[PDB]
Amino acid sequence: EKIPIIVGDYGPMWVYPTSTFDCVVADPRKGSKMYGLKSYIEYQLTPTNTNRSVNHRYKHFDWLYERLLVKFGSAIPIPSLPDKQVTGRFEEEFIKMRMERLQAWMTRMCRHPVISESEVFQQFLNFRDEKEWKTGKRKAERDELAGVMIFSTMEPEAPDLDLVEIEQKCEAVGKFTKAMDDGVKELLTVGQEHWKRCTGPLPKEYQKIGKALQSLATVFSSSGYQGETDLNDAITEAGKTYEEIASLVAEQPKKDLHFLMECNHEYKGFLGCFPDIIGTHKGAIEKVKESDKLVATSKITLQDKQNMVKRVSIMSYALQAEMNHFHSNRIYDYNSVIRLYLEQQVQFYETIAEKLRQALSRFPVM
Amino acid sequence: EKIPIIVGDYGPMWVYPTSTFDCVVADPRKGSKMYGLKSYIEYQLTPTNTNRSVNHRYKHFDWLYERLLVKFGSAIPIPSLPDKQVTGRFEEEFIKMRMERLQAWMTRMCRHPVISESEVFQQFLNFRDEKEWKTGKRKAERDELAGVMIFSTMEPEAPDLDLVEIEQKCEAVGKFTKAMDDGVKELLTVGQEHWKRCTGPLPKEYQKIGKALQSLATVFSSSGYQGETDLNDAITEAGKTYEEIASLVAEQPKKDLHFLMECNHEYKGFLGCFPDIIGTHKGAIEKVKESDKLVATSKITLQDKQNMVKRVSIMSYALQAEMNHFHSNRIYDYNSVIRLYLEQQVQFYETIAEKLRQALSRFPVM
């Protein structure tokens, strides 16, 4: 099973294929298994590498998830699959957001140099027989090259680093991830906090204003003063213009804030995984310090000792390999969502301004 | 003393001069009257009609106020002079807002067809000797043509109106003013409410955001990942950009909301003069209903009766005359402040947008 690690300017990294490939997930189908009124939803996965489509119910993705988690979980963070919700198994909204989350989940895997070209993931996609599948699902479940053993399939195209060099790279990752986790948890709180404020009390204000104005115009109109008519219209419109800004405001987070939040959630997810991934490397590095203590107590041999080293190094490269894939994608992701949030923001203010500028051009120069 | 009332399409109205004139008030001077460390502030009133300047301490305006109130108070609402404040007699802020309120107060009087061309108001302005003034202040205080008597100087260039027609115009004014008063009191509340929200909790938010972002960039920068540098700068700047929006926001009401509020206060003031002002007329109209009852009880004569009528009509024309001056100016005033508030609003949103659009363009492109 080929899992190579090469070095570079940025340091170790996986070998990214030259012939990249993604995958689409849509067309919420409906399929069946004698139970009466209990038909599970089925999605369609259309790879790009070969155009040959396939179907999969949510339960199969969960299955896929556990496999990937069990197989590489000790080295590669595995994207979280969405929760198992409010018993709303059948309408527009539900399938939509779920299919949205599955789409993003699939693309993550497809983009991963190591996962995307594994047997389990691959066979998960390209399969014809309704039984050619059962065979794979079976082969998958008996693959003992999982857990820590996955490192046994990795081949570093570089020298050894002592136990020392290993422990150090471990600490580093552990300090970055904890830091970024703490950092994203805030960005998430203020955002959720700002969100809650733009969809609630803020609109009501512009709503109270716009109404306050309109009632006043109504009062002037009862004045019964010769020589007026033009103003009460300008006023009344200003109010209605404000009411629309109330709507525009209360309906904006769904166009920008939302994406910024989602991106952060996805990442809070990757981060939540390091607590585990880091405890295993720590134990591994700690177990390699006893090498000397062991060799002297005549428990193992120098060859056994030297293996423990060349072996725990592979671990680092894999956790070096994984981070390098992380950072790579982190930098791309935040640069796109922020770029997106701002753009939407801009248009937002620009739009409001134009709305005011209109009600304005209704009041004479005097 | 000429105080004529003519009729028109809109009905009775004062005779507005053809050669209009305003007056400026600025340059907070400092005068002295041997008390030691007790020098009262003095303002400078520069009429436009003749360019000859004059000085006046606040105490003199109060004096002017009482005179105008005593003289025409039974027919013309007299703008309120600002309160007598927090014992902060000497700095930037205080004199500024006070001088602002005096300026607007003077312009109100200058714009009034009846007040502007009265002896007391006029002499208040154009006077040379430090004694030529004492003479006027003296002449003013002995003018018995005040209170109800002011109507004796009014000349209606129109026929007589009957008690019925009178009571009706009275009710009307009473219903409009009460209505508009109630209406402006709200516009004032939401505004004060919106104000308090833009100078407090709202900025703190954009402040928390901008900081949340900046801490996060700080965390990424500790990552120690080969292949990044450009993003943490874009992020950190976005935060600082938000902090500036916090300032911009918390500092906006002073540029628009403020004028809109002030205009409403001034008017809440005219309205508060309600009452008094339409229950001398109310009493007058009520006293004219007893005309018949009297003439029959042989208390007065038909000639006496017919006088009461032609006489209470003059009152209406003078009042009616007052409203027509009110509405006239009301329509101009609201059309200018609203026009002003919007314009400022527009620029506000336009500015914020431009600020975002900048942090946006810090975007790479990768």
Swiss-Prot record, chains A, B:
GO terms for molecular function: 1-phosphatidylinositol binding; Arp2/3 complex binding; cadherin binding; identical protein binding; phosphatidylinositol binding; protein homodimerization activity; ubiquitin protein ligase binding. The keyword Ubl conjugation applies. Residues 21-132 form the PX domain. The modification N6-acetyllysine is found at K59. Widely expressed, with highest levels in heart and placenta, and lowest levels in thymus and peripheral blood leukocytes. Keywords: Acetylation, Cell cycle, Cell division, Cell membrane, Cell projection, Cytoplasm, Cytoplasmic vesicle, Endocytosis, Golgi apparatus, Lipid-binding, Membrane, Mitosis, Phosphoprotein, Protein transport, SH3 domain, Transport, Ubl conjugation. The modification Phosphotyrosine is found at Y10. Residues 163-366 form the BAR domain. It is a peripheral membrane protein. Changing K84A: Abolishes binding to phosphatidylinositol 3-phosphate, but not to phosphatidylinositol 4,5-bisphosphate. One of its GO terms (biological process) is positive regulation of GTPase activity. A 1,2-diacyl-sn-glycero-3-phospho-(1D-myo-inositol-4,5-bisphosphate) binds at R57, K59, R98. Ubiquitinated by ITCH. It is found in: Cytoplasmic vesicle membrane; Cell membrane; Cytoplasmic vesicle, Clathrin-coated vesicle; Golgi apparatus, trans-Golgi network. Involved in endocytosis and intracellular vesicle trafficking, both during interphase and at the end of mitosis. Required for efficient progress through mitosis and cytokinesis. Required for normal formation of the cleavage furrow at the end of mitosis. Plays a role in endocytosis via clathrin-coated pits, but also clathrin-independent, actin-dependent fluid-phase endocytosis. Plays a role in macropinocytosis. Promotes internalization of TNFR. Promotes degradation of EGFR after EGF signaling. Stimulates the GTPase activity of DNM1. Promotes DNM1 oligomerization. Belongs to the sorting nexin family. Homodimer, and homooligomer. Heterodimer with SNX18. Interacts with ITCH. Interacts (via SH3 domain) with TNK2, WASL and ACTR3. Identified in a complex with TNK2 and clathrin heavy chains. Identified in a complex with the AP-2 complex, clathrin and DNM2. Interacts (via SH3 domain) with DNM1 and DNM2. Identified in an oligomeric complex containing DNM1 and SNX9. Interacts with FCHSD1. Interacts with ADAM9 and ADAM15 cytoplasmic tails. This is Sorting nexin-9. It comes from Homo sapiens (Human). The gene is SNX9. The chain holds residues 230 to 595 of 595 of the full protein.
